[PDB]
Design a protein around this ligand. Structure first.
Ligand SMILES: CC(C)c1cc(C(=O)N2CC[C@@H](NC(=O)C3CC3)C2)[nH]n1
Ligand code: NI
Ligand SMILES: [Zn+2]
Ligand SMILES: [Zn+2]
Length: 577
């Protein structure tokens, strides 16, 4: 019944192309940009050793119930739709909480609580921890008593409402032991050896199982695992280990996912002044039918994923230009609601069968990922997938010159939502502008083109606020304050260039796009806490316009200045020798 989408493109680069990835990825950008994803086969000689010891490697597994893996059931969406219209009636503007790194499933919660008599019944029996069990929350961190706090605040009033009249008050594992499980589970499922079952067949059953209520299937996986804490699958020179010379080659490779975000073409190469969690690889131990839902990268960055070993990983990709198109259809399932909760769209995981997205007009490609193959993902490329069997993957985000203007657009879209930013785009660019040397030229040229657009937009904002009647201007240094203190009250953007603070509260800030929502205290008072007093326009644009127009002139001892100034040497140095 299932309809395999058209396969995504592959690249078998020569050893000479394989030497600078971000330069090799730039080549294939105009082409892969249109499939969203792209597979990459390295030379067959390229076989790095696995640095980790399977037999002594423990991880905490997460569970997946493919039936309730889709969160966008009709019943859940309408449930939430009703719950909000209830609180809008009561004038509270429903707030969805977060628990153990992710949103709470209120539908699931209310269903269960009522399955055992409700709030006061459960309270007078102390089964809140049994609740967190069935909701997949890891004990014994106190989740039980935490849900009670959220239920009573959000659901018990609806419980009474949804109930009779009832309203008077009140209100306001080891990898080794893991393969043994999977390779037994797979075979006993299809009754075959695991390396013998075709891919196309498993793809069929997976999508079958999701929507099949006729049978329930449980599967385990392990994801979002830090390399820092568990170790990478690649060899790296960090003092943990005497490094063999056999491995020396692969430890310095730029295709070692521990070296990517540091390359002179990456953005984070010299800005090791703000940790993000996105300059450090992650580990994804996979099992048959283990699935990840449709998603994009924080700040719309590239993703790159290597499959160290194991059975294949099935992908599904969607190009960038079809992103707004992609979101529109998932939103069609509850328009009234996603108006109230725009970002709740993304807070909800979903595996929308591609056929549907295809029969709604959305480009969908796919590939099977195999041991030793890279999968590269592009900005705003929604992607999903599952794994054919036991395997082990390692993934990293990264950012390139072409990404800069997109990140700027992503904030503007994060600001038009209520979404926190993992770092300040604007902050980043100036950190790059503060060391124009040792900085790849393509960035410089793009930065300038990007930075003037910001100065104008900022100066426009700097003048739009004084008419509103402010007089004082303190100077503050944001890069040294924690993000949670430099965010706007309702944006909620990480502010770095300029914000507005009054004496109404000690530390309560707002973005210059929402200067009114700070506090009713009139703009008569202060304060425009700024960072640079518009003497920056000359200074910093100079250092970068220099190396941006020093290379523009250099082309039109010359082979020496390109050595000292650290210029690229692909086609232009070829004429040298
Ligand atoms: C760099 C980090 C933030 C990332 C991961 C992805 C992504 O899409 N991935 C990772 C592996 C694969 N996920 C799985 O295989 C499931 C079984 C565990 C798909 N994008 N960025
Ligand atoms: Ni991803
Ligand atoms: Zn005030
Ligand atoms: Zn704001």
């Amino acid at each position: 019944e299932f309809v395999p989408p058209p396969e995504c493109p592959v690249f078998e680069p020569s050893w000479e192309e394989f030497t600078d990835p971000l330069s090799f990825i730039g080549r294939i950008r105009p082409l892969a940009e249109k499939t969203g994803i792209c597979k990459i086969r390295p030379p067959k000689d390229w076989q790095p050793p696995f640095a980790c010891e399977v037999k002594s490697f423990r991880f905490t597994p997460r569970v997946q119930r493919l039936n309730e893996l889709e969160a966008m059931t009709r019943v859940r969406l309408d449930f939430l739709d009703q719950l909000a219209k209830f609180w809008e009636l009561q004038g509270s503007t429903l707030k969805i909480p977060v628990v153990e790194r992710k949103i709470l499933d209120l539908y699931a919660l209310s269903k269960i609580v009522a399955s055992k008599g409700g709030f006061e019944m459960v309270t007078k029996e102390k089964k809140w921890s049994k609740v967190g069990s069935r909701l997949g929350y890891l004990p014994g961190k106190g989740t039980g008593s935490l849900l009670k706090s959220h239920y009573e605040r959000i659901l018990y009033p609806y419980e009474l409402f949804q109930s009779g009249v009832s309203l008077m008050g009140v209100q306001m594992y080891t990898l080794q032991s893991f393969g043994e499980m999977a390779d037994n589970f797979k075979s006993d499922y299809f009754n075959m050896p695991v390396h013998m079952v075709p891919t196309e067949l498993v793809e069929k059953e997976f999508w079958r199982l999701v929507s099949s209520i006729e049978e329930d299937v449980i599967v385990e996986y392990g994801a979002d695992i830090s390399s820092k804490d568990f170790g990478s699958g690649f060899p790296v020179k960090d003092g943990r280990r005497k490094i063999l010379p056999e491995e020396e080659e692969y430890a310095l490779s730029g295709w070692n996912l521990n070296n990517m975000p540091v390359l002179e073409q990456s953005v984070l190469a010299h800005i090791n002044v703000d940790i993000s969690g996105m300059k450090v690889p992650w580990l994804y131990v996979g099992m048959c039918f283990s699935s990840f839902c449709w998603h994009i990268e924080d700040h719309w960055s590239y993703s790159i994923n290597y499959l160290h070993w194991g059975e294949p990983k099935t992908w599904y990709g969607v190009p960038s230009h079809a992103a707004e198109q992609l979101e529109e259809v998932m939103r069609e399932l509850a328009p009234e609601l996603f108006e109230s909760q725009p970002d709740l769209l993304h807070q909800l995981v979903t595996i929308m069968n591609p056929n549907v997205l295809m029969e709604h007009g959305v480009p969908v490609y796919r590939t099977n990922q195999c041991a030793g193959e890279f999968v590269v993902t592009f900005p705003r490329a929604y992607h999903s997938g599952f794994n054919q069997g036991y395997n082990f993957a390692e993934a990293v985000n990264f950012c390139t010159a072409d990404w800069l203007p997109i990140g700027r657009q992503c904030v503007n879209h994060y600001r038009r939502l209520r979404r926190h930013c993992v770092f300040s785009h604007e902050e980043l660019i100036f950190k790059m502008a503060a060391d124009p040397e040792c900085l790849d030229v393509g960035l410089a040229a793009m930065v300038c083109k990007e930075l003037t657009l910001m100065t104008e937009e900022e100066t426009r904002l700097r003048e739009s606020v004084v008419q509103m009647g402010v007089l004082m201007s303190e100077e503050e240094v944001f890069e040294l304050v924690p993000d949670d203190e430099r965010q706007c009250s309702a944006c909620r953007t990480t502010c770095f260039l300029s914000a507005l603070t009054c004496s109404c509260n000690p530390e309560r800030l707002v973005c210059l796009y929402h200067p009114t929502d700070l506090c009713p205290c009139p703009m008569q008072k202060k304060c425009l806490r700024y960072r640079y007093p518009l003497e920056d326009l000359p200074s910093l644009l100079y250092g970068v316009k220099v190396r941006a127009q020093s290379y523009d002139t250099w082309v039109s001892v010359m082979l020496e200045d390109a050595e000292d100034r650290k210029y690229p040497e692909n086609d232009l140095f070829r004429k040298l020798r």
